[PDB]
Amino acid sequence: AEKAKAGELKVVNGAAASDQTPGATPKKLSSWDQAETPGHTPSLRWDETPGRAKGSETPGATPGSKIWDPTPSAETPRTDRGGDSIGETPTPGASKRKERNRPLSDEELDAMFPEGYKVLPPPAGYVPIRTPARKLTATPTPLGGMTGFHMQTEMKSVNDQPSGNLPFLKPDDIQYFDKLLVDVDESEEQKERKIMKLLLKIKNGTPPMRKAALRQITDKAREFGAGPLFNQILPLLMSPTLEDQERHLLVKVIDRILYKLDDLVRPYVHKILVVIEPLLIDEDYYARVEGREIISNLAKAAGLATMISTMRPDIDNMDEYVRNTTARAFAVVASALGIPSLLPFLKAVCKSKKSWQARHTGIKIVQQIAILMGCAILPHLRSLVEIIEHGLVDEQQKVRTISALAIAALAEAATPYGIESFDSVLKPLWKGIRQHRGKGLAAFLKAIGYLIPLMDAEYANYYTREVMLILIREFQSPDEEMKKIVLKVVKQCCGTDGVEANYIKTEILPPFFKHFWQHRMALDRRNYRQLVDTTVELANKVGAAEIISRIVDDLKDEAEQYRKMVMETIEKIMGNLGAADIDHKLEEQLIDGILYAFQEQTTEDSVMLNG
């Protein structure tokens, strides 16, 4: 198989001929670890990645040399990104040598506007007026001019959308629906686009019109085909003025038509995802679950190789936005078609030697797979780790940070099992724990944090006792990311059965209530919750009267949200441990605290009452 190494030089030469893309090559070679298993499937997938034409040529020649050696013992798409980055280097470079307003060319001019329009000169002279216009925008604005009106007695054409009804058009949407306005009728495809304005009935109108329209377009899917639809939709779902509802509804029609169309969507897949991937990152939750759903339906609807070969060029894209949302995309498609099918792609990506941004993306993909799949990662956990491990030592920083973070997400979905799979990862991490300043440090603390519950109370005894020091020292950083991490950490480390009470009581609690309990935290949401939880667990170990006894005095504090916080904390605490531990005086302060806080209620909520 060393002739699969020199043979990797051969394949690199041939595929490089048919330049420089590392990914497809490592995808090709990625079938070697199964060796003697590899089969015709490698022709299918690669069929989409390069030209399906050369596909039969390369895969065929590969099986010949492979079987022989054993016995004796889209391109345009990527071509565009290269030119895009090269122009970026040209312009960026020029300023050093030295936006949307950059002058344009007639082919670029023919690129924007749709079919059926003519360019006009009226004169050569009026054109010379347009050329002097720049000079005369300064010159003739500094000259005599004015307007006036005379009193004289006085046809008025216009168009709404008439036929029978045609529910109303917003003043902007005309640009899209103008073709419907003209009343020319009854004389092929132009009549399918014309009748496809039933979209307008879905967008605006009465709810019944939306319903009936929606069905009518569902049953016409197979008829009209995906091309005309998406051609007439994606502009709308791309509209700058788009509503909330209208968005959601167009999402619905995209789903319902994608329950039917299967082989048809292959050309449009990317052309879909570009609009849809912004749904994954959103403030609305229901928008996110919808988005994940429709990308699931799309990826499963299309083919694996369709998705893969589609989505490569977005990995190295300059903007990180598309890289990120693209990572969540791979998460969704991987939930669709399963981890093992998509593994060799990834495992090829994280070893890409071109540039770091790729590896950063792929690692983020590992993470978002960890979040999405969650508990179900379990079988392939080992292979995944074996992928990610090589980034922890990389020279670039990001890759290290996001890497260890992805380990965190894994272990958190790995809740206790598979400890030895993380095994080889540890020894570097602990070492890094020493030497790091800034965010990466905190990230490591996140990872190690989720790890510790998965270790043995003996090994984790030592290792834990080591983590406690840095954990102490790092309470004081102003970083809120920091405080989140170290907070949840304190939960897991100090919520360990193998930790001694008195040590926490002395070393931890005083700084804990000092720095962590403040009015910066409580006003925030996540910090609020997580703080509640951590405090609850510390109570779960050191006991009740301590924690409560220290936080009672704050029931009487001015602000609400803070009072709400300590109130729900007391609630959960006395919920678990029981009130038996509480002494007398502190109980007087309790009841008085609870009445007092209850007597001033700015909002209506259960927390005070259930409390």
Partner 1 sequence: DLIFCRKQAGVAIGRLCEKCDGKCVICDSYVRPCTLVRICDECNYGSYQGRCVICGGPGVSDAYYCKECTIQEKDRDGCPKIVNL
Partner 2 sequence: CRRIVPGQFLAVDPKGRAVMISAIEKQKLVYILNRDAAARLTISSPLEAHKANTLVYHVVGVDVGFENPMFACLEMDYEEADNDPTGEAAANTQQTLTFYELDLGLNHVVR
Partner RNA sequence: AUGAUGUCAUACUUAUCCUGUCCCUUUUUUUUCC
Question: Smallest distance, Å, CB 398 to RNA?
Answer: 5
Tokens representing residue 354 in the block:
């071109």
Least distance from partner 2 to the Cβ atom of residue 421, Å: 7
User: Which positions from 426 through 465 interact with partner 2, judged by CB under 8 A?
Assistant: none
Residues 413 to 442: which contact RNA by CB under 7 A? 413, 437-440
Sign for the pseudo-dihedral over CA of 52, 54, 56, 60: negative
By a kind-dependent CB cut-off of 5 to 8 A, residue 421 interacts, out of partner 1, RNA, partner 2, none, with partner 2
Q: Return the range that interacts with partner 2 (CB under 8 A); candidates 36-44, 84-92, 414-422, 500-508.
A: 414-422
Distance CA 209, CA 222 (A): 22
CB contact at 8 A, 66 and 28: no
Q: Which does 281 bind (CB under 5 to 8 A by kind): RNA, partner 2, partner 1, none?
A: RNA
Instruction: Please identify, using beta-carbon distances, which residue of 454 and 551 lies nearer to partner 2.
Output: 454
CB 507 within 8 A of CB 470: no
With contacts defined by CB under 8 A, name the span among 50-58, 188-196, 198-206, 373-381 that binds partner 2: 373-381
382 binds, among partner 2, RNA, partner 1, none (CB under 5 to 8 A by kind): partner 2
Here's the x/- map for partner 2, 375-394, by CB under 8 A: it reads as: ---xx-xx------------
Closest CA to 50 of 80, 83, 82, 27: 27
Q: Rg (Cα) of the chain, in Å, rounded?
A: 32
412-to-88, 334, 446 alpha-carbon distances in Å: 40, 19, 10
Selected binder of partner 2 within 55, 344, 418, 453 (CB under 8 A): 418
The encoded tokens of residue 369 equal 């797979």
Return the structure tokens found at 552.
Answer: 């009672």
**Residue 268-307 contact track with RNA, rule CB under 7 A, x = bound:** ------------xxxx-x--x-------------------
Residue position matching structure tokens 């091309």: 227
Query: Applying CB under 7 A, does 201 fall inside the site for RNA?
Result: yes
Start-to-end CA distance of the chain, whole Å, equals 69
419 touches partner 2 by CB under 8 A: yes
Q: Are 359 and 324 in contact (CB under 8 A)?
A: no
For residues 81-140, which are near RNA according to CB under 7 A? Answer: none
Rounded alpha-carbon distances, angstroms, from residue 575 to 491, 536, 567, 580: 18, 10, 12, 11
Shortest gap between Cβ of 384 and partner 2 (angstroms)? Answer: 12
φ, ψ for residue 309, nearest 5 deg: -55, -35
Q: Of the ranges 10-18, 21-29, 247-255, 419-427, which one interacts with partner 2 (CB under 8 A)? A: 419-427
389 in contact with RNA (CB under 7 A): no
Region for residue 44 given its phi and psi (left: phi exceeds 0; alpha: psi -120 to 50; beta: otherwise): alpha
Q: Does 409 bind RNA (CB under 7 A)?
A: yes
Query: How many residues bind RNA, per CB under 7 A?
Result: 31
Contact between 467 and 491 under an 8 Å Cβ cutoff? The reply is: no
Cα(59)–Cα(310) distance, rounded to whole angstroms? Answer: 20
The verdict on 320 binding RNA (CB under 7 A) reads yes
Residue ranges that bind RNA, judged by CB under 7 A: 198, 201, 212-213, 216, 280-283, 285, 288, 320-321, 324, 371, 397-398, 409, 412-413, 437-440, 477-479, 481, 525-526, 529
Residue ranges that bind partner 2, judged by CB under 8 A: 378-379, 381-382, 417-421
